[PDB]
Design a protein around this ligand. Structure first.
Ligand SMILES: CCCO[C@@H]1O[C@H](CO)[C@@H](O[C@@H]2O[C@H](CO)[C@H](O)[C@H](OCc3cn(Cc4cccc(C#CCN)c4)nn3)[C@H]2O)[C@H](O)[C@H]1NC(C)=O
Ligand SMILES: CCCO[C@@H]1O[C@H](CO)[C@@H](O[C@@H]2O[C@H](CO)[C@H](O)[C@H](OCc3cn(Cc4cccc(C#CCN)c4)nn3)[C@H]2O)[C@H](O)[C@H]1NC(C)=O
Lengths: 133, 133
């Protein structure tokens, strides 16, 4: 299990940046953002080869323990064995996820959080740097 | 109150780099490192004006909830209302803390930790970036 951070106090409009190494044999990794492990405004899960999925980003929310409706993106700007940076902001409507290779997408903000206080990383991504603008 | 991180998986010789903002009205800040919140190999407490100390770094350990004996350092390269970087590494014998302006000091590794998994900030220092070398 990877880096867990709490008390982040990330306010709307502020940018969370995470840079890490994707393993040469990576199958998937996860970056969870929210209030705590049961309350995630973003579960961000690039799947290189996991759960039957190939090169697909899976996103979801979790509210009071309950997973929301999953959504898949259609661009996969990650490569095993390379460094990748992810930048996330939010407002009350949406989280904006900025990825490598110019790609950006929005994910609806389905929870009611004043700030993002919790990050957790897991899977085949070694975190090298985290910046809170 | 400040950032709390766990599962850092810092190993001997690896560098933990923490950059942050020293508050304009700064009186004291803390970085705690260790196994968990009850087992600290380093409580790093620059005191601008706090607990009877002026411009003094106080260091301590905490072992199973019990504070150790404080050590007072000889240098103070911090200023209120500035950005500062601290770099920490450790080995079997000591932690090495590198400070602004080319200062450094050693603090004994009293707990004989082989890994640092926990970091917490408090006080008048706002963490802006954390990096792992
Ligand atoms: C048409 C029916 C199909 O329905 C399927 O139903 C599954 C749930 O039963 C979904 O799967 C869940 O989907 C959820 C979001 O919605 C979540 O991703 C969740 O995982 C949580 C989780 C697990 N982990 C641990 C971890 C993770 C990755 C690496 C490692 C490692 C390693 C070595 N270093 C460890 N962290 N978070 C996942 O299991 C499938 O998507 C879904 N497929 C679809 C809908 O087409
Ligand atoms: C004078 C005679 C008596 O002797 C004093 O006795 C005190 C208590 O035992 C020692 O002080 C304790 O020293 C310990 C290390 O040994 C620890 O630093 C501990 O603080 C734990 C702590 C508290 N926080 C929270 C936090 C952090 C920074 C900012 C704020 C704020 C604010 C807005 N008001 C809050 N994080 N860690 C400290 O209280 C003094 O050194 C000592 N002085 C001496 C012996 O000469």
């Amino acid at each position: 299990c990877g880096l867990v951070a709490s008390n982040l106090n990330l306010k709307p409009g502020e940018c969370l940046r995470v840079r890490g190494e994707v393993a040469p044999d990576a199958k998937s990794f996860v970056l969870n953002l929210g209030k705590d492990s049961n309350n995630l405004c973003l579960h961000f899960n690039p799947r290189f080869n996991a759960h039957g999925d190939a090169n697909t980003i899976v996103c979801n929310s979790k509210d009071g323990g309950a997973w929301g409706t999953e959504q898949r993106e259609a661009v996969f700007p990650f490569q095993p064995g390379s460094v990748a940076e992810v930048c996330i902001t939010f407002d009350q409507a949406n989280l904006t996820v900025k990825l490598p290779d110019g790609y950006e997408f929005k994910f609806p903000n389905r929870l009611n959080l004043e700030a993002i206080n919790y990050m957790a990383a897991d899977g085949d991504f070694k975190i090298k740097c985290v910046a809170f603008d």
